[PDB]
């Protein structure tokens, strides 16, 4: 007898048409073991159980809630536009993958006394498809390497700090530009040491000394230097270097 | 609750599985006789010791057993058309499909015609014979499928040969139905002069 | 790992991995199956494993003797090559049932192309 159950709320029972025969695949199993083995493998979309009968054999079945129905090929193909998907008309760069599923078949002998009572994955590699973190968009294996998406300093942060500078009223624009260039120089490189602090000095003057002439904000910039020499991050010869670079 | 909704939940899985059975019963994914739990199938062991040069003379044994020949030079005498206008006949040649071509090509020839009266039932006249040479050739049938004949007053078809290398027709009398664009029909008999 | 048990050792409850099939294709397959049963009657008459062939005669053939023959023909038009039968075995061949395993090679695609599709469908490349 075949039992179909929906949370026991609604249920239907039918009677087998001949024994040891598959209702769906129509296979004459000729063994209840070959039958039950056929049931799980062939009808994987469902679940199956043995509940015994007054005659001796009764089967109750239900849907596989965790059924593994999904596309198995290259994941990048699913999200392509229709027509472009399932092309298979040219070589496709795809990430390497490897799976191991059979190390040795157990080949245990059939035994119903144990089987009815019981009834009563070596993967390797980047399997799943990854997405662009910045924009929530699918990646492609082609650019799967260079995609740091991360660096010393994001652009929007540069915008926000510049805007916050203008809020200050006590600062003349001659000074305001000074730290804009100097700060934007900082998180561009992220110096953290006093030695780097000095090295940043000839570095910053080297890159933007001409721009200092262009803005003609030199005198404010020397004073901005003197503060660090007051903060011990600058030596006198360092100040001399800026003069030489400027001129 | 209602079993109709319960059936509706399970309808698609069963419908999918019914189609899956049909294709596998035609194009299986695996050999069921190789199943361990289906061990009664293919119970015979593999006797790899069996030699294969024996297949050489065994092939000759069946070949002289299966020697074939054909009559020679088709002939057929006309008989009155029956219906409640002359009639024409055509012969076609069917060829196997090759790698490049998408559908198997077919070639047709206008074998002949006859001036059949307007539905002559009985006592129409006082016969005429259609002469066919050895157009069919076993060597040609090696490269193309068997030929066939067409009849038009109105379409009808009748094939001469089969892939079993055995002729389908014989020198008896024939009366084929005649379909347009019981009912219209033409009669005749086959000869081998 | 020597103590590696079966593949079931994964999880208790996780989000569904999304089903690859679709609805509109499901209905088309069903109706294709439905119209398939309207002529082949696999589900209704063949019990899901057989097809019914009803015999019809195209031509009547009489030899010199009393072995008058008929050329039996079946409606699906994808059936086996057409054969000559006599008058005596008319009227019970009017319902022929053939198992799926006994169908000819070409009939596999004649009944339904979707039974097997040559996916390239053309010579894009070797």
């Amino acid at each position: 007898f075949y039992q179909f159950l929906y949370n026991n709320n609604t249920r239907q029972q039918t009677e087998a048409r001949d024994d040891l025969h598959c209702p769906w695949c129509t296979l004459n199993c000729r063994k209840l073991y070959s039958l039950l083995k056929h049931l799980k493998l062939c009808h994987s979309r469902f679940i199956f159980n043995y509940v015994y009968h007054p005659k001796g054999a009764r089967i109750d079945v239900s849907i596989n809630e965790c059924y593994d129905g999904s596309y198995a090929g290259n994941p990048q193909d699913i999200h392509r536009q229709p027509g472009f998907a399932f092309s298979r008309n040219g070589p496709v760069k795809r990430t390497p993958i490897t799976h191991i599923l059979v190390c040795r078949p157990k080949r245990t002998k059939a035994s119903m006394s144990e089987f009815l009572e019981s009834e009563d994955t070596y993967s390797s590699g980047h399997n799943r498809l990854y997405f662009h973190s910045d924009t929530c968009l699918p990646l492609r294996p082609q650019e799967m390497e260079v995609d740091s998406e991360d660096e010393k300093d994001p652009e929007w942060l540069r915008e926000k700090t510049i805007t916050q500078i203008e809020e200050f009223s006590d600062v003349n624009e001659g000074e305001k530009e000074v730290m804009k260039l100097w700060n934007l120089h900082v998180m561009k490189h992220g110096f953290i040491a006093d030695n780097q602090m000095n090295h940043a000095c000839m570095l910053f003057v080297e890159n933007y000394g001409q721009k200092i002439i262009k803005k003609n904000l030199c005198r404010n910039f020397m004073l901005h230097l003197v503060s660090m020499h007051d903060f011990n991050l600058i030596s006198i010869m360092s100040i001399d270097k800026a003069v030489t670079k400027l001129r | 609750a209602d079993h109709e909704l319960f059936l509706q939940a399970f309808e698609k899985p069963t419908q999918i599985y019914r189609f899956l059975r049909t294709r596998n019963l035609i194009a299986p994914i695996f050999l069921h006789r190789t199943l361990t739990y289906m061990s009664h199938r293919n119970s015979r062991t593999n006797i790899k010791r069996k030699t294969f040069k024996v297949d050489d003379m065994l092939s000759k044994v069946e070949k002289m057993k299966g020697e074939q020949e054909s009559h020679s030079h088709l002939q057929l005498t006309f008989t009155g058309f029956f219906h409640k206008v002359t009639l024409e006949v055509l012969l076609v040649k069917v060829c196997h499909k090759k790698r490049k071509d998408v559908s198997c090509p077919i070639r047709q020839v206008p074998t002949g015609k006859k001036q059949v009266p307007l539905n002559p039932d009985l006592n129409q006249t006082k016969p005429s014979l259609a002469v066919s040479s050895n157009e069919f050739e076993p060597s040609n049938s090696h490269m193309v499928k068997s030929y066939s004949l067409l009849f038009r007053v109105f379409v009808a078809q009748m094939t001469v040969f089969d892939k079993n290398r055995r002729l389908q027709l014989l020198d008896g009398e024939y009366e084929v139905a005649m379909q347009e664009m019981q009912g219209p029909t033409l009669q005749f008999t086959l000869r081998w002069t | 790992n020597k103590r590696r048990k079966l593949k079931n050792k994964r999880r208790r409850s996780l989000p569904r991995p999304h089903d690859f099939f679709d609805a509109q294709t499901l209905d088309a397959i069903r109706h294709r199956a439905i119209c398939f049963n309207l002529s082949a009657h696999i589900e209704s008459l063949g019990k899901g494993h057989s097809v019914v062939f009803h015999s019809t005669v195209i031509a009547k053939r009489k030899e010199d003797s009393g072995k008058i023959k008929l050329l039996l023909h079946w409606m699906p038009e994808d059936i086996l090559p057409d054969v000559w039968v006599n008058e005596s075995e008319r009227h019970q061949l009017k319902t022929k049932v053939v198992h799926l395993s006994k169908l000819p090679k070409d009939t596999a695609l004649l009944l339904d192309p979707n039974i097997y599709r040559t996916m390239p469908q053309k010579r894009l490349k070797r």
Binding site: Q13, T14, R17, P23 | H3, T14 | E43, S44
Partner: peptide, 29 residues
Amino acid sequence: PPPATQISDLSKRKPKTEDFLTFLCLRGS
């Protein structure tokens, strides 16, 4: 549904329209 007729419930469930066959599938409605 009270009559657990046969396995025919499959033949009852699928052809709900378009000339339901066997004329007896209505019993296991």
